C-alpha cells in the first residue's frame, strides 16, 4: 500500500534578485529591507516560505517509492531495519567502497530490504 | 442500562408536543382577537416583537471605540455574524447607536428553526461544538430545563424565563453572503440601503444567508 503524497508547491523558493546578480545565491533569505518589493507582498512578487506550505504529516519525508530513507555504512547497519522492511529503505553512504557495497547489496537481498543505491560504483 | 434512551425519547416528544401547543395556542388567540375586533368595529393594536436578530454587515476596520464596544457586547465580532437579541429600551438604543454596522429585524419561527438546526452551536468547555444530539444539549442546558433542541427553539422564539442563559450558551451564527441592498450598504434600508431596521423583511435576507 502507498498513500497519495500531495505537495502544495513543487517549485523552489529562490532568493530575491538572485536571477539578476551572480553574487546573490539562490538559497532563500527573507528580505529585511524597508522598501522591499517581496517582503511587502506586492502583486506578482509575493512568494515566501510559510509554515502553511508544509506537506501532510502522514507522508512527510517519504520517498516516491513509499518508504523512508535509512543510511547504512556496513552490513551490520542493515540489521537495524530488518524488522521494518515495509517502512524503511536502505541507503549506502557516498563514501562506502565498492567491495563493502557488494556485501551490503547481497545481504539486503537476504533480508529482503529495498536498497536505493543498488546501481552505484558498478564495475566497467 | 441503556433503557433510559427509550424514556428520554418519550420525554422529548412530550416536551415537543407541549411546546408546539404554546406556539399554536398563542397564534389562535391573536387571530381570534383580530377577527372579533373586526366584527365589533373596534381597533386592535398588535404587540411589539420581543425577539430580534441582528447581522454584522461591515468589517472590523474603521470603527469608533464606542461602536467597537457595543458590537462586542452583542457578540457581533465578525462580518456576516447573526445573534438573537432581546427587545427593550436598553438594547434598542444600543442597536440604534451601531445602526450603520448592523441590519436587524424580527424573525419568524421558521427562521429561528433553520438557523438553530443548520448553523446552531454551543460553547462547551470553551469549545464551539456544533449541535449534533439532544444529549449534548441536555448536558449543557439540563439545569435550565432545556433538554432537547425543540426546547431550545421554543425558548428563543418566545423569550422565556431562561432566555439569557440559553442565548448566552448559543455561539453566534456564521452566515453566508447575499445581496445586501438595492443601492448599497452605505445608506439606511428605508432609503433603499443595507443597514438599519428591516422589521419582518429581514427574513428574506436570512433566507439567502443561512
Amino acid at each position: 500500500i502507498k498513500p497519495k503524497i500531495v505537495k502544495k508547491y513543487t517549485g523552489h523558493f529562490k532568493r530575491f534578485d538572485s536571477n539578476r546578480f551572480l553574487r546573490v545565491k539562490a538559497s532563500w533569505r527573507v528580505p529585511r529591507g524597508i522598501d522591499n518589493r517581496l517582503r511587502r507582498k506586492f502583486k506578482g512578487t509575493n512568494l515566501l516560505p510559510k509554515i502553511g506550505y508544509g506537506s501532510a504529516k502522514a507522508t512527510r519525508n517519504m520517498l516516491p517509492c513509499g518508504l523512508y530513507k535509512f543510511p547504512v555504512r556496513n552490513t551490520t547497519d542493515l540489521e537495524m531495519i530488518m524488522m521494518q522492511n515495509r517502512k524503511y529503505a536502505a541507503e549506502i553512504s557516498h563514501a562506502v567502497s565498492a567491495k563493502k557495497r557488494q556485501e551490503i547489496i547481497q545481504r539486503a537481498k537476504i533480508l529482503n530490504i529495498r536498497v536505493l543505491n543498488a546501481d552505484a560504483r558498478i564495475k566497467k | 442500562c441503556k433503557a433510559r434512551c427509550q424514556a428520554f425519547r418519550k420525554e422529548v416528544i412530550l416536551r415537543t408536543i407541549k411546546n408546539h401547543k404554546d406556539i399554536e395556542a398563542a397564534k389562535k388567540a391573536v387571530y381570534t382577537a383580530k377577527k372579533n375586533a373586526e366584527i365589533n368595529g373596534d381597533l386592535y393594536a398588535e404587540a411589539d416583537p420581543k425577539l430580534i436578530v441582528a447581522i454584522r454587515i461591515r468589517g472590523i476596520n474603521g470603527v469608533s471605540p464606542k461602536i467597537k464596544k457595543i458590537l462586542k457586547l452583542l457578540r457581533l465580532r465578525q462580518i456576516n455574524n447573526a445573534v438573537f437579541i432581546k427587545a427593550n429600551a436598553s438594547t434598542i438604543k444600543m442597536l440604534r447607536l451601531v445602526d450603520p454596522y448592523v441590519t436587524y429585524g424580527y424573525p419568524t419561527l421558521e427562521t429561528v428553526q433553520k438557523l438553530i438546526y443548520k448553523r446552531g452551536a454551543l460553547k462547551i468547555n470553551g469549545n464551539r461544538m456544533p449541535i449534533t444530539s439532544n444529549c449534548m444539549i441536555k448536558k449543557a442546558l439540563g439545569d435550565k430545563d432545556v433538554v432537547c433542541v425543540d426546547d431550545l427553539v421554543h425558548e428563543i422564539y418566545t423569550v422565556g424565563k431562561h432566555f439569557k442563559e440559553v442565548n448566552n450558551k448559543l455561539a453566534p451564527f456564521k452566515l453566508n453572503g447575499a445581496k445586501i441592498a438595492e443601492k448599497n450598504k452605505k445608506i439606511h434600508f428605508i432609503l433603499g440601503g443595507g443597514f438599519g431596521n428591516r422589521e419582518l423583511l429581514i427574513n428574506k435576507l436570512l433566507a439567502n444567508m443561512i
Partner: protein
C-alpha cells in the same frame, strides 16, 4: 477577520517539573496521574506546587512546623519545599513530608520521635490527603523585595542599591 480583544498567547502556568531532575520529573508524573484519576484537589495542589520555580518555593523551618502543628497532634504536615532547622527553639514530635530535609533538621525531627517522609511515601500512605496540613513558607521575606520600586516614593520607598558613596 474577527475582532478579538487579544490573541492567543501561552498561559503563564507551569505544568512540569522545571529542570532536568530525574526524581522531580517522576514526582510530577506520579501526582499528575494521581490528580487526573483520583480527581482530588489535594493532588492538584501538590502537583501545581511541585512545578513552581525555586524562588517561589520558600523554606519552612522546624519552629514554624511546631507552631502550626500545635493543635494537630496526629497529623502529617505537608510542605512542598526544603525544611530547615531553627536552632533557637526546640522541635516537638511530629511527622513532616517535604521535598528535602536539612541534615540538622532531619536529626532534630527524628531525635524528638517524629518522622521525616518523602512525597512518594505520602502518596502511598495518604494519596488523597486525609490527616495532612498544607503549609507553605513566606514569600515576602526575601531581601530582593526591599529594593523594588522608587526610593523617592512618598508612601513605600525602595531601599537604594548600595554603591558609590552611599550614606
Amino acid at each position: 477577520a474577527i475582532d478579538l480583544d487579544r490573541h492567543h498567547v501561552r498561559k503563564h502556568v507551569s505544568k512540569t517539573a522545571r529542570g532536568n531532575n530525574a526524581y522531580m520529573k517522576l514526582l510530577v508524573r506520579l501526582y499528575g496521574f494521581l490528580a487526573r484519576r483520583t480527581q482530588s484537589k489535594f493532588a492538584k495542589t501538590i502537583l501545581h506546587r511541585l512545578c513552581l520555580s525555586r524562588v517561589n518555593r520558600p523554606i519552612v523551618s522546624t519552629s514554624k512546623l511546631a507552631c502550626l502543628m500545635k493543635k494537630h497532634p496526629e497529623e502529617t504536615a505537608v510542605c512542598v519545599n526544603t525544611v530547615t532547622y531553627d536552632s533557637r527553639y526546640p522541635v516537638p514530635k511530629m511527622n513532616v513530608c517535604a521535598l528535602k530535609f536539612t541534615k540538622t533538621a532531619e536529626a532534630a525531627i527524628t531525635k524528638a520521635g517524629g518522622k521525616c517522609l518523602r512525597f512518594d511515601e505520602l502518596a502511598l500512605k495518604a494519596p488523597t490527603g486525609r490527616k495532612t496540613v498544607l503549609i507553605r513558607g513566606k514569600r515576602n521575606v526575601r531581601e530582593a523585595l526591599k529594593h523594588f520600586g522608587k526610593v523617592c516614593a512618598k508612601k513605600n520607598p525602595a531601599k537604594q542599591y548600595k554603591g558609590k558613596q552611599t550614606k
